[PDB]
């Protein structure tokens, strides 16, 4: 429904999000993933650690890329094309920081994983396996959250303006006559 | 895997895309056996024919109006 879909990585499972994104790419939809450092995996920290190790790219984005490439038949032409369609990032780099980001309900940890079951954060795994950039991304994220709070205040003001405009349109006749007649 | 079920229809069997069954021809006398069956059959000059004979066969075939499958072979290449 959009030329490009920006999916937040927070609170999602790597397998389900990767499967959904791979399915979308194979259908031609362009998707970009951001804030993949805070992606989630089911199980305990050690088990995912040794899984990524017995694979042994250290960055969370690269781990997500591998998980998604496992779906797609990359060795074929179609799989390669799906792969260039994809984009993955840790944190939000520009210009997507100025664009709202959807959530995939199917991969949400809150809706999927039962309370009282151990999970693992991909950022901690990546840092433990030798990804020495989790620190810089966190400060950028804090700055992004400050900017997002400012944007939320601006959006609240915009919603108040929208309410005033909707009230103004209400006291106009033509819309009221149209609604009564039809639509 | 080859098997009988793949067999082609009899009415279309042994037919070139031109629609003419190929018949080997050695000399003018064998060419003349295909005098009227021009629609059903097309002549094919044998591999061992000399160049001098092939032009005569081609001339007689044109006179009879019988399609030759491999003209300009050993008189031209490919």
């Amino acid at each position: 429904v959009e030329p490009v879909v920006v999916i937040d990585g927070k609170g999602h499972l790597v397998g389900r999000l990767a499967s959904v994104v791979a399915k979308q790419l194979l259908n031609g939809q362009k998707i970009v993933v951001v804030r993949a450092e805070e992606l989630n995996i089911s199980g305990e920290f050690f088990r995912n650690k040794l899984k990524y190790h017995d694979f042994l790219f250290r960055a969370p984005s690269r781990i997500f890329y591998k998980a998604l490439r496992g779906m797609v038949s990359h060795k074929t032409a179609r799989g390669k094309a799906a792969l260039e369609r994809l984009k993955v990032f840790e944190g939000i780099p520009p210009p997507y920081d100025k664009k709202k980001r959807v959530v995939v309900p199917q991969a949400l940890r809150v809706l999927r994983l039962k309370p009282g079951r151990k999970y693992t954060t991909l950022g901690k795994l990546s840092t433990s396996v030798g990804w020495k950039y989790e620190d810089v991304v966190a400060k950028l994220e804090a700055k992004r959250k400050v900017s997002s709070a400012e944007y939320y205040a601006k959006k609240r003001a915009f919603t108040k303006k929208v309410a005033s405009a909707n009230a103004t349109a209400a006291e106009s006749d033509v819309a009221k006559q149209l609604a009564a007649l039809g639509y | 895997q080859p098997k009988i079920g793949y067999g082609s229809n009899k009415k279309t069997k042994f037919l070139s895309p031109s629609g003419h069954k190929t018949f080997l021809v050695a000399n003018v006398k064998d060419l003349e056996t295909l005098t009227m069956h021009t629609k059903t059959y097309a002549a094919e000059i044998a591999h061992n024919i000399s160049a001098k004979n092939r032009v005569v066969i081609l001339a007689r075939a044109k006179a009879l109006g019988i399609k030759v499958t491999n003209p300009k072979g050993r008189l031209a290449l490919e």
């Binding site: 305990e44 050690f46 088990r47 040794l50 190790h53 017995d54 042994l56 | -």
Partner: protein, 530 residues
């Protein structure tokens, strides 16, 4: 001993750092400390392992892999067990070295690659490894912690040595792939770590004399790369290469590749000792082999090396004088590629030693009529040598004029365009230094080159006759060659002729070589520019 830090960076006892005048501990004192260092190593590190076993999820899942997993999975699990705590887990280090030693080539290569990654991850120091007996500040008052560290350093040095043994046995493996991979690992370790550099270099330079030419070429390439990465070991590498080439049992293959490697070394104006080493080595080898087709190539390479090292080499001229006649014997040899380099060496020695040089110019005037010169790949070196020789002989006007005449004589019957353009450019430049050469045009062959089929040759000849030199770039070999002409003429070079728009290109700007192209395009219109 803490595990959170690489075990070399762990702070040692202070007593290590101000004890250089300590009395030499007796061997029993060293032995007891070595033993006490050992017991402290397989001490609490076990308690660390006991702490490790408390995590049942971690112990069981890994023990299953270490027991039932595949070889790749076991190699990985062992590698991690070493990354997490290399000091504590001597059992996993021993286990990893044990996979390197099996009969299975693929797994042994995988295990050795894992060890190479472990070594080249910074786990090995910036410095070399020290034996326990050679540690600084080795005293009775040293603590258990530092004593265990020194014992582990000795153990890891022995580990590296046995890994080198495993390399050596595998490096002679019959399979070409195994030898190539072992060579790559050896040169990686040699380039990136200092430990046992002499032995690693010994193995690598030993593989120059391998039976397979591919392995020898790979070794030569890797050695040249090693020299470039670390210029300071250039002398050591050259000495190592000399150590094999001069062996009584050297074998022609080994010495040939070694001479190639020495030739491809780089020299600077402060390395007179290295150049003086190389020139003497080349002469010793030359006397060794002189005292045929296989010989011709080796002499070609040796002459190349001596020419390369003759600058930068401060050797008395009398040394070359001993071989001078011998060099002339090469100039009439079967392989003209050797005679070119022999003439180069003769010219350089004659110039620096200031010999009479008549015999050299006689041999050059002769070699101009050598029929093999026409089909020689090295015509460019011959061109440069001719230019230098004629420039150096500006006083003998008759001699240089005679060379000019014979040069044109030889050029009239050649097929290589680049060489002919080269001679014409040289003659144009030699005219500047020696203007009397132009008198020959007023006081016959040039008419043919003015009517040469190649437009570039015609333009060069016209410029030489007219004296209009400003529009000539120095001709470059590899240009005007037939394959290059085809690459233009097919219109698909891609690092195209059709892409450029020829409707608007200044006529004089257009190079003579492409004029016909221009015509077609300005006639075709349509797909002129695409």
């Amino acid at each position: 001993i803490p595990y959170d830090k690489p075990w070399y960076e762990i702070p040692l006892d202070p007593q290590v750092g101000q004890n250089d005048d300590v009395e030499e501990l007796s061997k029993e004192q060293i032995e007891k400390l070595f033993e006490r260092g050992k017991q402290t190593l397989e001490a609490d590190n076990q308690t660390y392992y006991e702490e490790f076993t408390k995590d049942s999820s971690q112990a069981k899942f890994m023990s299953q892999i270490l027991s039932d997993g595949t070889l790749n999975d076991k190699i990985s699990a062992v590698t991690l067990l070493i990354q997490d705590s290399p000091l504590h887990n001597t059992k996993s280090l021993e286990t990893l070295v044990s996979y390197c030693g099996k009969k299975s080539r693929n797994s042994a290569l995988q295990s050795l690659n894992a060890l190479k990654d472990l070594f080249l991850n910074g786990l090995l120091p910036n410095r070399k490894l020290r034996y326990f007996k050679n540690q600084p500040g080795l005293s009775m008052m040293l603590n258990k912690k530092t004593l265990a560290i020194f014992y582990f350093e000795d153990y890891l040095k022995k580990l590296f040595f046995r890994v080198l043994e495993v390399l050596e046995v595998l490096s002679h493996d019959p399979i070409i792939h195994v030898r190539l991979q072992i060579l790559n690992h050896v040169f990686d370790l040699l380039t990136n770590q200092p430990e046992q550099e002499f032995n690693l270099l010994r193995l690598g330079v030993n593989k120059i004399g391998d039976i397979d030419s591919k392995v020898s070429s790979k070794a030569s390439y890797l050695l040249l790369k090693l020299e470039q990465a670390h210029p300071n070991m250039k002398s050591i590498v050259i000495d190592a290469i000399v150590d094999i080439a001069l062996r009584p049992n050297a074998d022609y293959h080994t010495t040939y590749y070694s001479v190639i490697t020495l030739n491809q070394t780089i020299l600077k104006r402060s390395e007179d000792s290295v150049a003086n080493k190389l020139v003497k080595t080349y002469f010793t080898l030359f006397e060794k082999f002189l005292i045929d087709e296989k010989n011709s190539k080796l002499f070609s390479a040796l002459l190349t090396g001596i020419n390369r090292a003759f600058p930068f080499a401060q050797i008395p001229a009398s040394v070359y004088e001993v071989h001078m006649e011998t060099l002339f014997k090469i100039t009439h040899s079967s392989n003209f590629n050797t005679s070119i380099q022999a003439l180069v060496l003769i010219n350089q020695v004659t110039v620096k030693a200031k010999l009479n040089s008549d015999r050299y110019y006689r041999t050059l005037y002769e070699s101009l009529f050598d029929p093999r010169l026409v089909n020689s790949s090295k015509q460019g070196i011959y061109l440069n040598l001719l230019y230098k020789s004629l420039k150096q002989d500006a006083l003998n006007v008759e001699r240089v004029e005679a060379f000019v005449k014979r040069i044109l004589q030889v050029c009239s019957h050649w097929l290589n365009v680049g060489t002919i353009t080269g001679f014409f450019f040289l003659l144009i430049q030699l005219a500047k230094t020696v203007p009397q050469i132009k008198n020959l045009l007023t006081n016959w062959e040039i008419n043919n080159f003015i009517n040469h089929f190649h437009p570039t040759v015609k333009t060069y000849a016209n410029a030489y006759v007219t004296g209009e030199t400003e529009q000539i770039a120095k001709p470059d070999l590899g240009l005007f060659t037939l394959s290059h002409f085809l690459d233009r003429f097919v219109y698909r070079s891609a690092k195209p002729v059709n892409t450029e728009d020829w409707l608007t290109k200044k006529v004089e700007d257009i190079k003579p070589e492409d004029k016909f192209f221009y015509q077609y395009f300005t006639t075709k219109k349509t797909a002129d520019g695409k």
